[PDB]
Write a protein that binds this ligand. Sequence first.
Ligand code: CAC
Ligand code: CA
Ligand code: CA
Length: 140
Amino acid sequence: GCARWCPQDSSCVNATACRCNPGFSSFSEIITTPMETCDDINECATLSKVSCGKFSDCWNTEGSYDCVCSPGYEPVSGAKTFKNESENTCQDVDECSSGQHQCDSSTVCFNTVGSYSCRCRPGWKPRHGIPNNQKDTVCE
Ligand SMILES: C[As](C)(=O)[O-]
Ligand SMILES: [Ca+2]
Ligand SMILES: [Ca+2]
């Protein structure tokens, strides 16, 4: 059988009951009424569950979730999206060597984990207001 009144995001279990689809939850384990709702589980809140690993972030979605390397980090496996630690290959991006940085020609790019900084070349001095060791740094 298959109850046809099954609420959204749930699938029939028999002729008089339904079950929330994987990724959703309901108040009762078994839906026996069309008034019951199947709500999205936030996999990123349960701090209990394992992590995405280092340099990553958990992003919740309606019906699922995704792990992504944080800004300043990129996956060596080309896999922009992953599910667990084991799939984590987020390494830091070297904006200086990759020439992706945007330091004033008057400065020298210095790479850091997750970011990067522009420093004053020796014998040079920072312009006014703006300080050194920064992405907006400028020297004269
Ligand atoms: C993509 As949907 C509205 O079936 O959760
Ligand atoms: Ca979710
Ligand atoms: Ca970096």
